[PDB]
mmCIF file of C-alpha atoms in Angstrom:
data_model
loop_
_atom_site.group_PDB
_atom_site.id
_atom_site.type_symbol
_atom_site.label_atom_id
_atom_site.label_comp_id
_atom_site.label_asym_id
_atom_site.label_seq_id
_atom_site.Cartn_x
_atom_site.Cartn_y
_atom_site.Cartn_z
ATOM 1 C CA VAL A 1 -16.429 7.408 -9.122
ATOM 2 C CA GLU A 2 -16.603 5.425 -5.817
ATOM 3 C CA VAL A 3 -14.277 3.168 -3.782
ATOM 4 C CA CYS A 4 -14.846 1.002 -0.674
ATOM 5 C CA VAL A 5 -11.766 0.937 1.518
ATOM 6 C CA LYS A 6 -11.022 -0.633 4.956
ATOM 7 C CA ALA A 7 -12.022 1.586 7.959
ATOM 8 C CA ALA A 8 -9.606 1.995 10.920
ATOM 9 C CA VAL A 9 -9.508 -0.820 13.519
ATOM 10 C CA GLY A 10 -11.536 0.566 16.466
ATOM 11 C CA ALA A 11 -12.474 3.769 14.535
ATOM 12 C CA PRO A 12 -15.099 2.848 11.832
ATOM 13 C CA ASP A 13 -15.574 6.498 10.680
ATOM 14 C CA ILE A 14 -11.795 6.907 10.039
ATOM 15 C CA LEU A 15 -9.644 5.751 7.092
ATOM 16 C CA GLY A 16 -7.930 2.430 7.835
ATOM 17 C CA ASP A 17 -4.625 0.801 6.958
ATOM 18 C CA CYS A 18 -5.300 -1.418 3.916
ATOM 19 C CA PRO A 19 -2.154 -1.170 1.661
ATOM 20 C CA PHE A 20 -4.181 -2.317 -1.403
ATOM 21 C CA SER A 21 -6.952 0.190 -0.699
ATOM 22 C CA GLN A 22 -4.245 2.880 -0.308
ATOM 23 C CA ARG A 23 -2.787 1.939 -3.740
ATOM 24 C CA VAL A 24 -6.292 2.647 -5.277
ATOM 25 C CA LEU A 25 -6.557 5.987 -3.358
ATOM 26 C CA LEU A 26 -2.995 7.015 -4.347
ATOM 27 C CA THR A 27 -3.951 6.384 -8.013
ATOM 28 C CA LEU A 28 -7.159 8.518 -7.708
ATOM 29 C CA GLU A 29 -5.166 11.266 -5.875
ATOM 30 C CA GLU A 30 -2.251 11.303 -8.397
ATOM 31 C CA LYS A 31 -4.734 11.388 -11.344
ATOM 32 C CA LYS A 32 -6.776 14.159 -9.549
ATOM 33 C CA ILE A 33 -10.053 12.164 -10.018
ATOM 34 C CA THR A 34 -13.078 13.226 -7.955
ATOM 35 C CA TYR A 35 -14.221 10.211 -5.942
ATOM 36 C CA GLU A 36 -16.456 9.148 -3.054
ATOM 37 C CA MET A 37 -14.650 7.161 -0.372
ATOM 38 C CA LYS A 38 -16.861 4.593 1.369
ATOM 39 C CA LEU A 39 -15.388 3.336 4.694
ATOM 40 C CA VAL A 40 -16.061 -0.340 5.475
ATOM 41 C CA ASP A 41 -15.711 -1.749 8.997
ATOM 42 C CA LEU A 42 -14.508 -5.298 8.171
ATOM 43 C CA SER A 43 -15.304 -6.544 11.760
ATOM 44 C CA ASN A 44 -18.997 -5.559 11.235
ATOM 45 C CA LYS A 45 -19.616 -5.281 7.445
ATOM 46 C CA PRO A 46 -22.883 -3.466 6.442
ATOM 47 C CA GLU A 47 -25.663 -4.747 4.079
ATOM 48 C CA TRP A 48 -24.960 -2.240 1.204
ATOM 49 C CA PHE A 49 -21.324 -3.494 1.104
ATOM 50 C CA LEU A 50 -22.187 -7.218 1.299
ATOM 51 C CA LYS A 51 -24.444 -6.698 -1.769
ATOM 52 C CA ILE A 52 -21.572 -5.190 -3.894
ATOM 53 C CA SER A 53 -18.714 -7.325 -2.376
ATOM 54 C CA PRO A 54 -20.202 -10.756 -1.384
ATOM 55 C CA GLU A 55 -16.671 -12.155 -0.683
ATOM 56 C CA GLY A 56 -16.422 -9.157 1.714
ATOM 57 C CA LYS A 57 -13.204 -7.811 0.249
ATOM 58 C CA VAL A 58 -11.711 -4.317 -0.072
ATOM 59 C CA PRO A 59 -10.781 -2.359 -2.136
ATOM 60 C CA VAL A 60 -13.796 -2.447 -4.474
ATOM 61 C CA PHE A 61 -14.039 0.196 -7.187
ATOM 62 C CA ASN A 62 -16.838 1.772 -9.266
ATOM 63 C CA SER A 63 -15.950 3.909 -12.377
ATOM 64 C CA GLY A 64 -19.448 5.363 -13.076
ATOM 65 C CA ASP A 65 -21.508 2.285 -14.051
ATOM 66 C CA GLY A 66 -22.812 0.344 -10.993
ATOM 67 C CA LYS A 67 -20.241 -2.439 -11.798
ATOM 68 C CA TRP A 68 -18.036 -2.972 -8.708
ATOM 69 C CA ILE A 69 -14.495 -4.240 -9.443
ATOM 70 C CA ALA A 70 -12.256 -6.132 -6.957
ATOM 71 C CA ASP A 71 -8.424 -6.698 -6.969
ATOM 72 C CA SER A 72 -6.263 -3.511 -6.668
ATOM 73 C CA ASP A 73 -4.242 -4.786 -9.685
ATOM 74 C CA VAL A 74 -7.352 -4.852 -11.962
ATOM 75 C CA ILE A 75 -8.691 -1.612 -10.313
ATOM 76 C CA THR A 76 -5.526 0.469 -11.032
ATOM 77 C CA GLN A 77 -5.476 -0.881 -14.645
ATOM 78 C CA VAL A 78 -9.170 0.101 -15.042
ATOM 79 C CA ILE A 79 -8.395 3.647 -13.754
ATOM 80 C CA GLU A 80 -5.384 3.911 -16.187
ATOM 81 C CA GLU A 81 -7.644 2.935 -19.163
ATOM 82 C CA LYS A 82 -10.620 5.218 -18.329
ATOM 83 C CA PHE A 83 -8.380 8.172 -17.096
ATOM 84 C CA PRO A 84 -5.107 7.884 -19.155
ATOM 85 C CA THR A 85 -3.825 11.337 -18.178
ATOM 86 C CA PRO A 86 -1.636 12.125 -16.210
ATOM 87 C CA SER A 87 0.461 8.951 -16.945
ATOM 88 C CA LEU A 88 1.176 6.403 -14.171
ATOM 89 C CA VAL A 89 2.175 3.647 -16.611
ATOM 90 C CA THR A 90 5.189 1.693 -15.254
ATOM 91 C CA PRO A 91 7.255 -0.069 -18.021
ATOM 92 C CA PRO A 92 6.418 -3.853 -17.827
ATOM 93 C CA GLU A 93 10.175 -4.605 -17.258
ATOM 94 C CA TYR A 94 9.990 -3.005 -13.722
ATOM 95 C CA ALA A 95 6.566 -4.504 -12.704
ATOM 96 C CA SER A 96 8.009 -7.052 -10.182
ATOM 97 C CA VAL A 97 10.289 -4.471 -8.449
ATOM 98 C CA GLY A 98 10.153 -4.864 -4.642
ATOM 99 C CA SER A 99 7.285 -7.445 -4.800
ATOM 100 C CA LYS A 100 8.870 -9.886 -2.261
ATOM 101 C CA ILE A 101 9.528 -7.145 0.402
ATOM 102 C CA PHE A 102 5.946 -7.121 1.848
ATOM 103 C CA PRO A 103 5.480 -10.922 2.485
ATOM 104 C CA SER A 104 9.089 -11.100 3.852
ATOM 105 C CA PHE A 105 8.264 -8.136 6.189
ATOM 106 C CA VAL A 106 5.045 -9.968 7.362
ATOM 107 C CA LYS A 107 7.024 -13.214 7.957
ATOM 108 C CA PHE A 108 9.704 -11.352 10.010
ATOM 109 C CA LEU A 109 7.085 -9.281 11.903
ATOM 110 C CA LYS A 110 5.045 -12.427 12.926
ATOM 111 C CA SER A 111 8.284 -14.295 13.906
ATOM 112 C CA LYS A 112 8.914 -14.878 17.676
ATOM 113 C CA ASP A 113 12.084 -17.005 17.091
ATOM 114 C CA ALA A 114 15.175 -14.855 16.224
ATOM 115 C CA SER A 115 17.189 -18.011 15.251
ATOM 116 C CA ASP A 116 15.080 -18.455 12.040
ATOM 117 C CA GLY A 117 16.051 -16.905 8.676
ATOM 118 C CA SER A 118 13.164 -14.352 8.491
ATOM 119 C CA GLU A 119 15.339 -11.227 9.247
ATOM 120 C CA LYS A 120 17.918 -12.260 6.531
ATOM 121 C CA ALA A 121 15.306 -13.082 3.821
ATOM 122 C CA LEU A 122 13.813 -9.558 4.324
ATOM 123 C CA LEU A 123 17.250 -7.857 4.278
ATOM 124 C CA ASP A 124 18.000 -9.663 0.946
ATOM 125 C CA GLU A 125 14.781 -8.337 -0.649
ATOM 126 C CA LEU A 126 15.604 -4.783 0.596
ATOM 127 C CA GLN A 127 19.220 -5.082 -0.682
ATOM 128 C CA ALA A 128 17.810 -6.119 -4.120
ATOM 129 C CA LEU A 129 15.410 -3.104 -4.150
ATOM 130 C CA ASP A 130 18.289 -0.703 -3.234
ATOM 131 C CA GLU A 131 20.233 -2.179 -6.209
ATOM 132 C CA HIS A 132 17.291 -1.422 -8.626
ATOM 133 C CA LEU A 133 16.816 2.106 -7.166
ATOM 134 C CA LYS A 134 20.548 2.910 -7.450
ATOM 135 C CA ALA A 135 20.542 1.879 -11.163
ATOM 136 C CA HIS A 136 17.027 3.243 -12.061
ATOM 137 C CA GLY A 137 16.025 5.768 -9.310
ATOM 138 C CA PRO A 138 14.754 7.992 -7.664
ATOM 139 C CA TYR A 139 11.510 6.009 -8.197
ATOM 140 C CA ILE A 140 10.984 2.479 -9.666
ATOM 141 C CA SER A 141 10.756 4.036 -13.199
ATOM 142 C CA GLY A 142 12.240 7.488 -14.026
ATOM 143 C CA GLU A 143 12.383 10.772 -12.103
ATOM 144 C CA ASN A 144 8.521 10.611 -12.085
ATOM 145 C CA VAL A 145 6.205 8.535 -9.816
ATOM 146 C CA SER A 146 4.369 5.600 -11.502
ATOM 147 C CA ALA A 147 1.766 2.801 -10.742
ATOM 148 C CA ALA A 148 4.348 0.367 -9.228
ATOM 149 C CA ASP A 149 5.371 3.072 -6.664
ATOM 150 C CA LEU A 150 1.737 3.428 -5.592
ATOM 151 C CA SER A 151 1.678 -0.368 -5.086
ATOM 152 C CA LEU A 152 5.059 -0.605 -3.196
ATOM 153 C CA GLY A 153 4.932 2.704 -1.216
ATOM 154 C CA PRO A 154 2.076 1.585 1.123
ATOM 155 C CA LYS A 155 3.737 -1.851 1.622
ATOM 156 C CA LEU A 156 7.025 -0.119 2.592
ATOM 157 C CA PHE A 157 5.066 2.236 4.963
ATOM 158 C CA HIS A 158 3.652 -0.809 6.835
ATOM 159 C CA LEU A 159 7.198 -2.291 6.946
ATOM 160 C CA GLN A 160 8.576 1.014 8.344
ATOM 161 C CA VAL A 161 5.877 1.689 11.000
ATOM 162 C CA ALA A 162 5.133 -1.928 12.124
ATOM 163 C CA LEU A 163 8.779 -3.119 12.258
ATOM 164 C CA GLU A 164 9.779 0.018 14.248
ATOM 165 C CA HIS A 165 6.872 -0.475 16.701
ATOM 166 C CA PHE A 166 6.886 -4.251 17.254
ATOM 167 C CA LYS A 167 10.582 -5.173 16.882
ATOM 168 C CA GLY A 168 12.361 -1.789 17.166
ATOM 169 C CA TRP A 169 13.726 -2.660 13.711
ATOM 170 C CA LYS A 170 14.588 -0.084 11.027
ATOM 171 C CA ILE A 171 15.784 -0.424 7.363
ATOM 172 C CA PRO A 172 19.634 -0.181 7.587
ATOM 173 C CA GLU A 173 21.274 3.216 6.789
ATOM 174 C CA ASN A 174 23.345 1.174 4.260
ATOM 175 C CA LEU A 175 20.360 1.161 1.880
ATOM 176 C CA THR A 176 20.548 4.880 0.865
ATOM 177 C CA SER A 177 18.587 4.478 -2.408
ATOM 178 C CA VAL A 178 15.686 2.810 -0.421
ATOM 179 C CA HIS A 179 15.715 5.632 2.205
ATOM 180 C CA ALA A 180 15.763 8.390 -0.489
ATOM 181 C CA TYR A 181 12.797 6.595 -2.148
ATOM 182 C CA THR A 182 10.623 6.189 1.033
ATOM 183 C CA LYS A 183 11.429 9.836 2.071
ATOM 184 C CA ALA A 184 10.304 11.060 -1.409
ATOM 185 C CA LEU A 185 7.239 8.770 -1.673
ATOM 186 C CA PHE A 186 5.875 9.327 1.852
ATOM 187 C CA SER A 187 6.197 13.155 1.578
ATOM 188 C CA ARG A 188 4.051 13.302 -1.595
ATOM 189 C CA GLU A 189 0.659 15.079 -1.198
ATOM 190 C CA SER A 190 -1.216 11.912 -2.323
ATOM 191 C CA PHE A 191 0.634 9.794 0.330
ATOM 192 C CA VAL A 192 0.188 12.380 3.127
ATOM 193 C CA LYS A 193 -3.601 12.421 2.289
ATOM 194 C CA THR A 194 -4.146 8.599 2.156
ATOM 195 C CA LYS A 195 -1.741 7.109 4.744
ATOM 196 C CA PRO A 196 -3.286 5.563 7.923
ATOM 197 C CA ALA A 197 -2.373 7.245 11.226
ATOM 198 C CA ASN A 198 0.444 5.279 13.026
ATOM 199 C CA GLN A 199 -2.074 4.244 15.752
ATOM 200 C CA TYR A 200 -4.482 2.641 13.235
ATOM 201 C CA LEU A 201 -1.758 0.802 11.288
ATOM 202 C CA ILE A 202 -0.494 -0.670 14.649
ATOM 203 C CA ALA A 203 -4.100 -1.586 15.715
ATOM 204 C CA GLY A 204 -4.370 -3.386 12.350
ATOM 205 C CA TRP A 205 -1.254 -5.563 12.907
ATOM 206 C CA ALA A 206 -1.418 -6.069 16.731
ATOM 207 C CA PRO A 207 -3.884 -9.097 16.676
ATOM 208 C CA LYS A 208 -1.944 -10.694 13.749
ATOM 209 C CA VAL A 209 1.498 -10.289 15.483
ATOM 210 C CA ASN A 210 0.161 -11.742 18.809
ATOM 211 C CA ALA A 211 -1.841 -14.709 17.305
#
């Protein structure tokens, strides 16, 4: 088992901040699968990587056969089929939970005009996630962590770190179910082992925020 993930911006021999690559890693960590992690510097991609990912995209996964798979959605489904135990299956009904939070965070983060509706749109998506988590918590599905949490968790981590750093913005205390969820998700062994260091997540966003 092998996976190519994004290396840290300015530190090519260190794990980077790709939220989709972290979703793959969280899945491998929760399922206790032995895997080789291959770090890819996206600013200076090597030859071995360009051969297996010609579009130059990460994550890219290998199950055992030399067949490299792209798209973290296909990758996590491939892992679930080949390694069904322990279960990470999220019921299809809760698949879309918190999906609009990440692009709304990115839109608000990149915003330089406070008079636009980017702060409100993001608050609405977070209010809707708190509603789901109050009715179906602590996680997206039951009391147990599932696939959808490993997709959303990293996206929420970027939201937390980047919005605190660049705008001094935090998720309101009003959303208790969201806070309980991030506190539980981020403190999990798998998350502690695969999260980028604050420094590297900021170095990842900095040129995008300033552009």
